[PDB]
Structure 1
Amino acid sequence: RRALRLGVNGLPNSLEPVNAISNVGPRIVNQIFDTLIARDFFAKGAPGNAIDLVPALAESWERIDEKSVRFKLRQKVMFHDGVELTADDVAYTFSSERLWGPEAIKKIPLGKSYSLDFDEPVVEDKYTVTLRTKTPSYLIETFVASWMSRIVPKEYYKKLGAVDFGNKPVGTGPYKFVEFVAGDRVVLEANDAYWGPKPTASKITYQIVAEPATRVAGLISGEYDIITTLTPDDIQLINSYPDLETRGTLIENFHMFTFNMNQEVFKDKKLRRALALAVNRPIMVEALWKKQASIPAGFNFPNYGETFDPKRKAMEYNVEEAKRLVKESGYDGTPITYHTMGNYYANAMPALMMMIEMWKQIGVNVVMKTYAPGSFPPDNQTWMRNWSNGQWMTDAYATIVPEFGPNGQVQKRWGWKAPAEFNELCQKVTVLPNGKERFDAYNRMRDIFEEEAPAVILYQPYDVYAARKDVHWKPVSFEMMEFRNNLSFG
C-alpha cells in the first residue's frame, strides 16, 4: 500500500479528541478513533452530504425515555494497544471525571460548555451502557454521532492523563498513532486489526504548509497527494495539470468575525451592529468565492433539519444605518485591530482586506494583525478576530447554545452581556422536544443574535481540496476527511 502525504493549513495542539475540535483536528482524530454512531455521508449515492446515521462502535441503541439512551456495543473491538473495548471505556468517555464534571475542566477546557446536561453513564454489562441526562434531552443520539463523542480507552487515558494522551493517543480507529512533532507533522500508520473497512494507506502524514501558495507548489512538484484549504481562485491553475484536480464541497460550518466584548469599544451593541450592517456579503462571495460560498438567512443552516427555517429573511445590509450608528457610538477614528492566523481560514486575509475598505467607507478604521500557528495572543490584546463554527448536530442546538449560550465562551470568556430573554430561550430549547414552540424559540434567538451582533456570520465556505487524480478520495460536507470506503490508489 502507498503512503498518503497531506499538505495541511494547520495542526491541532492536541490529539485528545475533544481538545482537537477545530477545522484542523477532525481530519486526524477521525482516523485514530471511532464513535458509537457514525454518519454515512455517501449513503444512497449522495455526493458526500447524506445525513444517514449508521451503527459503528454501538451495534444497536434505543431511547428508554426523555433522559436516557441504551447502547449495545460491538464485541471483540480492539484498541490500538490490543485492549478490548468494553462498556467501561464508553462510560469513561462520557463521565463526570473525564468530560463534563468539575474535575474535567482543567483537562478539557470546553468539555462542560460543549456537552449535554449529563448524569453519570450506567454500565449494565460488559457490552451495554446507558448514557443519560439530568434534565430532558432529545439530543443524545446526535451528540453521540458527533466530534464530542470519540471513544477513548479508560485505563490508558487515566495512566497518561489528558495532556500526555493528547501527545500519544490510542483509539479503535482505522489508523494508529506514529509521531507528533509540535507545529510540524502528525504521522499515522494503518491499524490492520481494525473492526471496520480495512485501511487502504500504509501510512498517513499531515504536513503543515501554512502559506497556501507553498501548498499548491508542493502539489505541482509531487511532494503531496492531497492539499487542503484552497480558495475557488486556485481551481483553474490546478485543473490545468493533467495529473492534478480540485475536489470541493459546501461544508456544515460558517466563517465569521467576532468581538472581545470586555473591550470598552465593544461593551455596547451599537458599533458591533454598525460593523455588521456594512458587510456586503454578495460582493465578497462574487469576488472571493466565485459564487460557491453560501450566505445563510441568519444563524440557520440546512443540517438543522427540523430546526432549519427555509423561509427566514436575509441578514441586513444597510450602509446608511451603519453610518448613523458609528456617529451615535461616539467612535473617534482610533484604529481597531482584527486578529487573523494568516490564511488558517480559506480567504481570511482577502475577506478582511475587502471588509477594511467597506468599514473605512462607514468611518471605521480597522487594521489587520496577524498571529503565528498555535500562537493566539492574550485576550486583552484582541478587539476583533475571525473564527468559524462547525454545525455539529442535526439540530439548531449547535452552535448557538454551546458557543453563544449562558454557559458558553462568548458570554463567559468574551464578555457578551446577552439579554436575559436570550439565555432563558437557550435553556428552553435545551429541554424541549421538536415542535412549534421549539422552532419559534430558535427563530427568536436568531433575531436577538442579529440585534446584538456578538459575532457576525459571513458565509458557509466552499471547502476546496486539490489532489493527484490517482488518489481516489471524495470530500464530505464537514470539516473533516473521511477515508472509510473512501480512499484508494490508482
Structure 2
Amino acid sequence: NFDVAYQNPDKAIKGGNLKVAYQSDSPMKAQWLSGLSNDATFATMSGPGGGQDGLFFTDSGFKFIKGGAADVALDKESKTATITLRKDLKWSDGSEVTAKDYEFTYETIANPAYGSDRWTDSLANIVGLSDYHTGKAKTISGITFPDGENGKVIKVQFKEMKPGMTQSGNGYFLETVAPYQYLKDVAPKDLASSPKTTTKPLVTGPFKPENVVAGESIKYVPNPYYWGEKPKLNSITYEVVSTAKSVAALSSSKYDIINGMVSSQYKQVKNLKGYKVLGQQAMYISLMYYNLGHYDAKNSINVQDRKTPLQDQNVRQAIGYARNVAEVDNKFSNGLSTPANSLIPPIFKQFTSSSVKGYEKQDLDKANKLLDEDGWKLNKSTGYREKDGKELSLVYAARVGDANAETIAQNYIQQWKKIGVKVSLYNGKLMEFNSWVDHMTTPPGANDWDITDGSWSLASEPSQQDLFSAAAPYNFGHFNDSEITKDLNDIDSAKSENPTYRKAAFVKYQEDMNKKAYVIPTNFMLNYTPVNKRVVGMTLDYGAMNTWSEIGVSSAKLA
C-alpha cells in the first residue's frame, strides 16, 4: 500500500527552491571526502552534491550501468577493472576530474596519515594496495593510468576476480573521486578538518554547496559544470531537523521533504493533508539467531560445539514455525514491517525470489508435530515438553528498541508456550542495545543465551560473507555447515560471473539456510518519506539516477 513515486498532476515551474530536512537528534558532521566521512546524516545530505562524488550509475537492482559520471569495465582474463571518466566530468570550480583524482581516493583511505576508518581487507586484493597501506611502498602498483594522471582512464589490477564486482558497493574497488589539485597542499593530518573538505569543498554533482553551516545545514545551488542534465531548481536547502520537531514541521508545511523519519511517527504523518507519503523497501533484514557455539578468534573460525536442544533441526524449525510474525506486524508495525521469506529482501531482484519459503506463516501444528517426532514430549502436569526428563526451556535475549519491543517479545514467548517450550527473557528484561552488541560481538561468545534478535543493513552487493560464513566474527550463533559453506563459496565463484547462475546460487543458499534454520528470517522493512504535494518528479525508485536534476515544484507555495 505504498507508492514509490508521487505523480504530481500539476507541472513544474522553471526554477524554485526546494526545502528538505533530515531527521536527526545529533548534529550533521560535514565531510565531503568519502574516505574521511563517518556520519550517516551528512552522507544522505550530500546527495544533491553528488553523494560524496560517486562515479557510477546503476539499474534498479544496483548493478552498474554505463551512463554516469564514469563507467567501469571488468576483464576477467587480465584481472582488471577499467574506470573511464567522462570527457567533460568536472569539479564545481570548472577543473577537470582526472585519473589522479580517482587514485587519490585510495590514498585518503589507505594512507594512515589521513585518519580514515574505511580501510577494508578487501582492498588488499588490489595489487600493491596493502604495501602502500603498510608504508612498505610509496605508490600503488596495482593502479595505473593508460593516458597518465591528467587522463580520463584508470586501470585497477586485482589478485582475484569476484562476481560482486558488477554491483555497486562491492568494496573490491572504490566509487568516488577526490579533488587532488584542490587538496594537494593540505597536510594529511589536516585534511578532515580543512575548510576545503567541510565548508568549502569541490563537488561533482548537479548542485554544489554554496553555504555550509556546521552541524545544521547546506545551501545548494546549481553546479554550472555538471556533465549531466541541468537541474530545474534554482536551489535546495537541506537542514537537520529533530525527531521532536519533525511532525510539527510537516504540520506547518515547513519542508517539502523530510528524510529519515522513524516508524513510530508514521501514523502521525499518515493523514496530514498537503503531503503524499512514499514508501520503499529497505536494504534491510531482521532475523532470529540460535546459540550454537563459539568463535575461535585465533584460528578465525566458528565452532558449533554448544550444548543445547537447539542443535536439533526439528527444534530450530519448530520454534520458527511457532512465531506469529505476520500477525505481530499487522498489529503494531503499521505496515512498515513485512514478514521475511528469506535473508535477502526482494528489491535485490537478481539475488532472491518470492518462491523461497521460510517462516512467514505461523504453523503451530507443524511445530508441535516436529517436536513430537523428535522425542520432545509434553508433560500434562506442566504445560511443557521434556526429553529424558529434561524440560525444554530456553533463554531469550530480546532487545530494545524497535517500537513495541517489550510487546513483541512477550507475544513470541506466548506462541512458544503453545508449543510446550518455556521461554524467558535474558535477566528478566530487554537488553539495551550497546549491551547486546557487546554480548554478541565479544569472542568467544556467551553460553547464557539461546535465542536472540538481530538485524543488518545490506549493501548494494548483499554479501553474506561477513554475516554467516564460518570465518565470520559476526556469525552470532556460531554455526558451521559444510553445505552452507559450499553455498557461500559458490556465490563468490567464477561461475557466478554469469548472472543467471549467481541468482540460482543465492536462491539455493537462502533455501538451505531456511531448511537448516541456524537462523530464521523475521522481517523486511519499508522506509517512508513525506512529500509535499507541490513537488514534481519525486520518486524513491532505486533505478532513478537523475532525481536531483529531475526534481521540480508546481508552485512557490507549499501545499
- The partner residue of 2:250 within 219, 224, 233 is 219
Contact 1:422 1:445 in 2 (8 A): yes
What does residue range 91-490 of structure 1 map to in structure 2 within 5 Å? 91-93=103-105, 95=106, 97-99=107-109, 107-109=116-118, 111-112=120-121, 117-119=125-127, 120-125=142-147, 126-143=151-168, 149-154=175-180, 156=183, 159-160=187-188, 163-164=192-193, 170-177=202-209, 178-179=211-212, 181=214, 185-193=216-224, 194-199=226-231, 200=233, 202-210=235-243, 214-230=245-261, 238=269, 240-256=271-287, 268=306, 273=316, 276-289=320-333, 293-315=337-359, 317=362, 320=367, 336-340=397-401, 348-350=402-404, 353-362=407-416, 363-366=422-425, 367-369=429-431, 376=434, 379-380=437-438, 384=452, 386-393=454-461, 398-405=462-469, 410-411=474-475, 416-419=478-481, 421-432=483-494, 433-434=497-498, 438-450=502-514, 456-477=520-541, 483-489=547-553, 490=555
1:44 corresponds to which residue? Answer: none
1:38 Cα deviation after fit: 0.9
The reply to whether residue 4 of structure 1 matches residue 19 of structure 2 is: yes
Q: How many Å separate the matches in 2 of 1:461 and 1:74?
A: 36
Contact 2:170 2:460 in 1 (8 A): no
Does the residue aligned with 1:219 lie in a helix, a strand or coil? helix
Matched residue type, 2:203: G
Q: How many Å separate the matches in 1 of 2:108 and 2:397?
A: 40
Does the residue aligned with 1:426 lie in a helix, a strand or coil? helix
Query: What whole-Å deviation, never above 9, does each CA across 1:301-329 have from its counterpart, x for those lacking one?
Result: 44444443443223375564698699789
2:55 corresponds to which residue? Answer: 36
Change (3 A) 1:442 1:180: farther
1:345 corresponds to which residue? Answer: none
Change (3 A) 1:385 1:245: same
1:361 Cα deviation after fit: 4.5
Change (3 A) 1:104 1:406: farther
1:64 corresponds to which residue? Answer: 75
Q: How many Å separate the matches in 2 of 1:351 and 1:479?
A: 34
Q: Which stretch shifts more, 187-196 or 21-30?
A: 21-30
Contact 1:27 1:482 in 2 (8 A): no
Query: What whole-Å deviation, never above 9, does each CA across 1:25-73 have from its counterpart, x for those lacking one?
Result: 65224333343321366xxxxxxx8978342121x55433353232321
Query: What whole-Å deviation, never above 9, does each CA across 1:157-212 have from its counterpart, x for those lacking one?
Result: 88446754886665322344544755xx343522523332345252432314235x
Query: What whole-Å deviation, never above 9, does each CA across 1:424-461 have from its counterpart, x for those lacking one?
Result: 54333223222776455434432454467676433332
Aligned length: 455
Contact 1:231 1:289 in 2 (8 A): no
Which runs of 5 or more residues in structure 1 are unaligned? 42-48, 341-347
The reply to whether residue 90 of structure 1 matches residue 99 of structure 2 is: no
Q: How many Å separate the matches in 2 of 1:431 and 1:280?
A: 37
Change (3 A) 1:227 1:262: farther
Identity %: 14
Does the residue aligned with 2:146 lie in a helix, a strand or coil? strand
Change (3 A) 1:240 1:426: closer
Q: How many Å separate the matches in 2 of 1:441 and 1:160?
A: 44
Matched residue type, 1:354: I
Contact 1:284 1:351 in 2 (8 A): no
1:3 Cα deviation after fit: 5.0
Change (3 A) 1:231 1:205: closer
1:248 Cα deviation after fit: 2.0
Computed over aligned residues only, the root mean square deviation of the Cα atoms, in angstroms, reads: 4.7
Contact 1:23 1:479 in 2 (8 A): no
Contact 2:323 2:415 in 1 (8 A): no
Contact 1:117 1:133 in 2 (8 A): yes
* TM-score of the pair, normalised by structure 1: 0.72
Q: How many Å separate the matches in 1 of 2:166 and 2:22?
A: 34
Matched residue type, 1:37: F
1:333 Cα deviation after fit: 7.0
1:89 Cα deviation after fit: 1.8
Change (3 A) 1:473 1:280: farther
Contact 1:37 1:57 in 2 (8 A): yes
Does the residue aligned with 1:299 lie in a helix, a strand or coil? coil
Which runs of 5 or more residues in structure 2 are unaligned? 1-15, 128-141, 296-303, 377-383, 417-421, 441-448
Contact 1:80 1:191 in 2 (8 A): no
2:34 corresponds to which residue? Answer: 17
Does the residue aligned with 2:175 lie in a helix, a strand or coil? coil
* TM-score of the pair, normalised by structure 2: 0.65
Does the residue aligned with 1:31 lie in a helix, a strand or coil? helix
Change (3 A) 1:20 1:407: farther
1:358 Cα deviation after fit: 1.1
Q: How many Å separate the matches in 2 of 1:23 and 1:280?
A: 33
Q: Which stretch shifts more, 279-288 or 360-369?
A: 360-369
Change (3 A) 1:290 1:173: same
Contact 1:39 1:53 in 2 (8 A): yes
Contact 1:37 1:144 in 2 (8 A): no
